[PDB]
Each structure stands twice: as structure tokens, then as C-alpha cells.
């Protein structure tokens, strides 16, 4: 099929999406950047989709409920920071004609593709409008323990392997509301790169808080300007998840493959995949990221708090002063 747009595709139903993706890239992602809006779109995709249970009715999953029922879902504590994300998305969404769910999930996949090293995520298309808001408490909190995290994910259909896979997202992530004095504080020292740096950096001994001291949801971090979530800390070190976490360190392909597979499930939670169309070809091709990660300057294996009995990966050390991580620019 040649779309009237000129683009070629497997299914005519995907033709609408080529202009939408251009709209996103220009008017949401500032010309296809791995910046605030791209990171935000991935976070929104997770918040929308996790409003789902295999067992009980905890929402329609990846239905775009978090947009259509924005007023309700933005009242929930774990959706802190989401208002800024949806506020910025709405002007773009409004000119697309898409269901809220197809828009949220497309934007999350396109945004991810803007980050060097990221997978080109599967994009299934065809999410009917949402019927109801998710209830409260579907989204994990950074103060949650591993029991609670693993329980919530399992309820939605994800095992421990998949939880670690999905936390790869924190390689391109910053916090705006855990400490409102330091918006845009990243979780790793390569917030514009979809690499395995966050898996290493969370394993370093934490030494300081990045902003206005101790705030609920964070723990001591190893670098000035870097935030460490309490949830990432406990998942990295718990016996159920530690080997999974360590395996990601300096293993770019394991991270990307694991993440790609888990995201393909996440982004269709609640949906009837047999009634959807494969429109994966509308997602931009991401820039590659091969070479290895390295320790931040001044650190070494002495500073790693190794939580798994497997031999730790060999990672190059860098001579120099400990680095300061810059905040992410607001837009
Ligand atoms: C235990 C599970 C999780 C917890 C407790 C958690 C918690 C957090 C917190 C507290 C923030 C900072 C929010 C703010 O202050 O603005 C954040 C950011 C983010 N999270 Fe997670 N998260 C989890 C899982 C995930 C998953 C599964 C994804 C996607 C697959 C995701 C993607 C992101 C992204 C992309 C950001 C960055 C947003 C930005 O830079 O604007 N998270 N997360
Ligand atoms: Ca939802
Ligand atoms: Ca990174
Ligand atoms: Mg383990
Ligand atoms: Mg290992
Ligand atoms: Mg911007
Ligand atoms: Mn943000």
C-alpha cells in the first residue's frame, strides 16, 4: 500500500499514523529529541497501561483512561507529575483524531525511539475509547517495598524478569515532583541515552541527596545532581531481582530485548490484540548505541554494592573528579 502521504505500509489502516508521527516529532518532541517530552511520554504510557488486572477489574489497561478521565486519575498520589505531562500532550492530541489510548501508546513508542540505544518498539494500533477511569492504587509508589512492587506487577501479568526489564526506562528518566526544588533531576548520568548506565549507578554506594535533603521516595545517591529512587534501590538488591538487575549492567542487548518484549505486552494490556492492526512501521528508527558503559569518574568496583553472586561485568574506570549531573531542560 502507498499511503496518499507517499509512505508505504503493510496495512492501509496505518496510513493515518504517518502524519500523526510527524506532528508528534515536530510539536511534542521538539524535532525528534530525547528530552523532557519523550521521557514523559514513556512514563505516561506505563501509568495508563498499569491500570489493569488479570484477576479483578482495575481498569481497561492501555485504554487512554489517563487522558479521557484526566481529572479523576490526576487525583491519585502515584500520578504526581502526570498533570504536567498531559497538559503538554493535549494540544497535540487534539489535532490527531486518535483514540486517547492509541495516542498515549504511539507517543510513548515514538518518544522512546528518539533516545539513542532504544529499541524500535512494536506498535499495535486500535485501542477503543476508555469506558471508565482506573481506580486508585494501580500505580506503584517509589516508597513501595519489593513485595508490593512484585505483587502489583504480577496482578497485571508481569513476572520479576519483566519488572526489571521495564525499569530499564529509568535510563532516560528524571524526577520533577519527588523534590520540587530540583525539577529535572536524572536517575542516571546519561539521561539522553538509552543505555545500561542506570543499572550500574544504582549499585554504587549512595553518599548524598541531590536537592533539599531527604524526601520520601528517594535514598542516598552516588552523584551530585543524580536522584536514586527507593524502589530502584530495593529492586536492585533484593534476592528475587538482584541477579536480573546485575545481568543488565553493561549488557545493552539484554536490556533492549527484555524491555522491547515487556513493552509489547504492557502497551496492549486490556486490549484485544486480534482486533488490532500491526503498525510498527510508523515508529522512527532509533539511533544505535553500542560501545560499553563506564564508571563515572573516580569510582571503581570498590564502590559497587554487589547483590548477586555472578561475577560482575568488567567496566572501565575513568580518572578524574566525580562528575555533576546536569538537570534536564524543562522542554
Ligand atoms: C516500581 C515501578 C516504578 C516506580 C515506583 C517508579 C517511580 C518513578 C518516579 C517516582 C519518577 C519521578 C516522577 C517525578 O518526580 O516527576 C519516575 C520517572 C519515570 N518513570 Fe518510573 N517508576 C516505576 C516504573 C516505571 C516503568 C515501568 C516505566 C516505563 C516503562 C517508567 C518510566 C519512567 C520514566 C520515563 C520517567 C521519567 C519521566 C521524566 O523524565 O519526565 N517507570 N518513575
Ligand atoms: Ca488506563
Ligand atoms: Ca541513560
Ligand atoms: Mg536474584
Ligand atoms: Mg551479571
Ligand atoms: Mg520541549
Ligand atoms: Mn519529567
Author numbering: 1 to 331
Give the published text.
Manganese peroxidases (MnPs) are, together with lignin peroxidases and versatile peroxidases, key elements of the enzymatic machineries secreted by white-rot fungi to degrade lignin, thus providing access to cellulose and hemicellulose in plant cell walls. The primary mechanism involves the MnP oxidation of Mn2+ to Mn3+ and the subsequent formation of chelates with fungal dicarboxylic acids. The molecular structures of Ape-MnP1 and Cst-MnP1, which share 50% amino acid sequence identity, are characteristic of ligninolytic peroxidases.
Besides the amino acids of the polypeptide sequences, final models, crystallized in the presence of manganese, contain a heme prosthetic group, two structural calcium ions, and a substrate Mn2+ ion, as well as 180 (Ape-MnP1) and 171 (Cst-MnP1) solvent molecules (with three Mg2+ ions from the crystallization medium also present in the Cst-MnP1 structure). Mn2+ binding was confirmed by anomalous difference electron density maps. Ser40, which occupies the position of the second glutamate acting as a Mn2+ ligand in known long and short MnPs (Glu39 in Pch-MnP1), shows an increase in the Mn-residue bond length to 3.93 Å. This distance leaves Ser40 outside of the coordination sphere in Cst-MnP1, confirming that this residue is not involved in Mn2+ binding. As for Cst-MnP1, the E36A substitution in the Cst-MnP1-E36A variant resulted in the complete loss of the enzyme's ability to oxidize Mn2+, as expected given that Glu36 is one of the only two amino-acid residues (along with Asp176) that contribute to Mn2+ coordination in this enzyme. Regarding Cst-MnP1, the analysis of the E36A variant demonstrated that a single acidic residue (Asp176) at the Mn2+ oxidation site is insufficient for the catalytic process, as previously observed in a VP mutated variant containing only an Asp at this site. This confirms that the catalytic site of Cst-MnP1, formed by Glu36 and Asp176, fufills the minimum requirements for Cst-MnP1 to act as a MnP. Moreover, this site is stabilized by Ser40, which contributes to anchor the internal heme propionate to the alpha-helix, where Glu36 is located, as inferred from the analysis of the S40A variant.
